[PDB]
Amino acid sequence: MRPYEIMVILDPTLDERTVAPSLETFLNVIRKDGGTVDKVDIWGRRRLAYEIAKHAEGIYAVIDVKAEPATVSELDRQLNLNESVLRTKVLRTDKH
Amino acid sequence: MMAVKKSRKRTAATELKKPRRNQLEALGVTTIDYKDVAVLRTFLSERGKIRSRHVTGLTPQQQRQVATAIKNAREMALLPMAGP
Amino acid sequence: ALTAEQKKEILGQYGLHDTDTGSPEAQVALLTKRIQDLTEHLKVHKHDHHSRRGLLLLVGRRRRLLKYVAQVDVARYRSLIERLGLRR
Amino acid sequence: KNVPHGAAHIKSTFNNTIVSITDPQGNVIAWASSGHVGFKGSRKSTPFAAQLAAENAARKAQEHGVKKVDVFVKGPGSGRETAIRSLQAAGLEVGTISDVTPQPHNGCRPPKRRR
RNA sequence: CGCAGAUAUCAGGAGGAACACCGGUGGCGAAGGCGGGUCUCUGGGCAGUAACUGACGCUGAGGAGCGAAAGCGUGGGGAGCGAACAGGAUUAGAUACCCUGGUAGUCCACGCCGUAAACGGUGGGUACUAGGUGUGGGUUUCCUUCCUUGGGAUCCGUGCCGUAGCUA
């Protein structure tokens, strides 16, 4: 299947104690499609370049999914419709 | 010890100079993403604009992936653009 | 798009032997695959003129090959047409 | 009321120059302009007119209780640095200096060419 | 336009086109022409091996298809710009350049027309025919640290100088 580098930014009102599973709740839908080996990092509370909705910092995270395009676009649809994300983005790890 | 050019004492050296420089590929650079702000911001001006190849030294391949990652970084706000 | 395994399929079925690549039969089969795939692309993307030009070119070379094959032997020409289901 | 420190917005263009004071929050206290000093027409782009405008606005600021002032300069200014020097003479401490000039990232269309 | 509280300034919100630096004798495309970013679908191009088929090639009357901007039709949308139009102003008079306002139109979808300084003003294709010169792409031996506009040699694409030769 295809690899990606899904970036996500969330509000600081959440907490590190609860960051990781919030992603997992979404990611399970991919996990039950392709045995999708994931390699996830969490680093937040980082100052931004410019305020989004009166926020100085955000919660960064990098979810290296190895899955299919339908599934990643569906995941993006879910992530954006969620009420907490400030932003998100999906770069392809392969040549394009 | 020697001139900047015409130094037949040594091998034709692997040196970078005022006209010539190949700054990403050669050294000082780990991996080319928007996520690594520190390697990227070195290739900018003081005020947030972007440098030129004829001053830096890069090839268009390298300069354009640089610009790409810079611009993605500006959209994820890792790196500043200029605004009030 | 045309993957190496699709190429393996075509070169195994219509390819004379498991190695030939330049033969008219194999080349026509690959081009016909490519052309039906691209036609289905155009069903949706109606304005991809840069792709329709490539289509016309590949069709040109395909008719060239069919015509060469007919010059050589009409038997193999028509048997190829019959096997691919094509009309011309 | 009264305020000890503020900023000063200095809009300098081809046909006029208006220099106002403000708190750092954006609320203005007293402003002055080149046509308001008395000049008229095209007389009010020369930097002497900006000296005069900045002078009156700074003395109003003193009358309100301002001592230290930032500066935010905006536009093509015949008398930018003229105005700044006259401000710094007429009873003010120039804290911070900036070139805040609104540039668009190739946005809306500009008008045509003149002749 | 204001004096009914403008311009200026500051927070928020609405909005719809164009993407500063990267960006240039610079890349892609047959040509027109193409640059905010990410994804998806697709196309041609160059190089290396040159395994493979064995002259299938070149052109092309007609014909079909593509084709800037303006203009046409139906719907939506319209911030800025702006023909027409209105007013001020210079003027011999100014239906014009200047200023202030501003409609269609420019914008998206889908059907049209089929024109341009659509210009390298050089139709296409193949080969021979001094070099020097930057610059882009991929191979590769030599000084090799072997990290390099290293240099050499080959392939393609690109701009300047220059003999023969050609030209009014």
Q: How far apart are CA B14 and CA D93, in angstroms?
A: 54
List residues bridging with D68 in a β-sheet. D5, D93
DSSP string, C23-65: SHHHHHHHHHHHHHHHHHHHHH-TT-HHHHHHHHHHHHHHHHH
Decide the pairing of beta strands D17-22 and A66-67. unpaired
Q: How many other CB atoms are found less than 10 A from the CB of residue D83?
A: 28
Q: How many other CB atoms are found less than 10 A from the CB of residue C36?
A: 10
CB–CB of C66/C88 below 8 Å? yes
Buried b (16+ CB within 10 A) or exposed e, A40-54: eeeebeeebbeeeee
Buried b (16+ CB within 10 A) or exposed e, A57-96: ebbbbebebbbeeebbebbbeebeeeeebbbbbbeeeeee
Handedness of CA C11, C14, C20, C24 (dihedral sign): negative
Chain A residues with CB inside 8 Å of B71's CB? none
Q: How far apart are CA D59 and CA D66, in angstroms?
A: 9
The closest alpha carbon to B77, from D28, D7, A8, D35, belongs to A8
Number of domains chain C contains: 1
Q: Obtained via which technique?
A: cryo-EM
Q: What's the burial of D36, exposed, middle or buried (CB within 10 Å: 0-12/13-18/19+)?
A: middle
Decide the pairing of beta strands A2-10 and A66-67. antiparallel
The closest alpha carbon to D90, from D65, D64, D67, D115, belongs to D67
CB–CB of D6/D22 below 8 Å? yes
A-contacting residues of B 27-46, CB under 8 Å? 33, 35
Q: How far apart are CA B80 and CA A51, in angstroms?
A: 11
Q: How far apart are CA D89 and CA D69, in angstroms?
A: 12
Domain residue limits at C2 = 1-88
Q: What's the burial of D92, exposed, middle or buried (CB within 10 Å: 0-12/13-18/19+)?
A: buried
Q: How far apart are CA D74 and CA D103, in angstroms?
A: 10
What does the block give as tokens for D84? Answer: 């700044």
A44: which residues sit within 8 A by CB, 6+ positions away?
A: A10, A12, A16, A19, A57, A58, A59, A60, A61
Q: How far apart are CA B43 and CA B24, in angstroms?
A: 10
Nucleic strand E within 7 A of Cβ A89: yes
D51: which residues sit within 8 A by CB, 6+ positions away?
A: D79, D82, D83, D86
CB atoms A91 and B75 under 8 Å: no
DSSP string, D68-101: EEEEEEES--TTHHHHHHHHHHTT-EE----B--
Q: How far apart are CA D98 and CA D88, in angstroms?
A: 15
Q: How far apart are CA A59 and CA A27, in angstroms?
A: 17
Nucleotide nearest to B47 (CA to C1'): E21
Cα–Cα separations (whole angstroms), residue D61 to A20, B6, B38, D41:
55, 67, 44, 27
CB–CB of A75/A68 below 8 Å? no
SS3 readout for D2-60: CCCEEEEEEEECCCCEEEEEECCCCCEEEEEEHHHHCCCHHHHCCHHHHHHHHHHHHHH
The closest alpha carbon to B22, from B49, B62, B51, belongs to B62
Nucleic strand E within 7 A of Cβ B23: no
Buried b (16+ CB within 10 A) or exposed e, D46-67: ebbbbbbbbbbbbebbeeeebe
CB–CB of D84/D110 below 8 Å? no
Decide the pairing of beta strands A57-64 and A2-10. antiparallel
Q: Across the A/B interface, how many CB contacts are shorter than 8 Å?
A: 28
Question: By three-state DSSP, how is residue B82 classified?
Answer: coil
Q: How far apart are CA A8 and CA A79, in angstroms?
A: 9
CB–CB of A85/A10 below 8 Å? yes
Q: What are phi and psi of D27, to 5 degrees?
A: -80, 125
CB atoms B77 and A91 under 8 Å: no
DSSP string, A28-64: HHHHHHH----EEEEEEEEE-SS-SSS-SEEEEEEEE
Picking from A4, A7, A62 by the largest number of B CB atoms within 10 A of its own CB, the best residue to mutate is A7
Q: How many other CB atoms are found less than 10 A from the CB of residue B62?
A: 19
Chain A residues with CB inside 8 Å of B81's CB? 49-50
Nucleic strand E within 7 A of Cβ B81: yes
What does the block give as tokens for C88? Answer: 């011309």
The label of the residue with tokens 């970084």 reads B73
C31: which residues sit within 8 A by CB, 6+ positions away?
A: C58, C61, C62, C65
The label of the residue with tokens 């910092």 reads A57
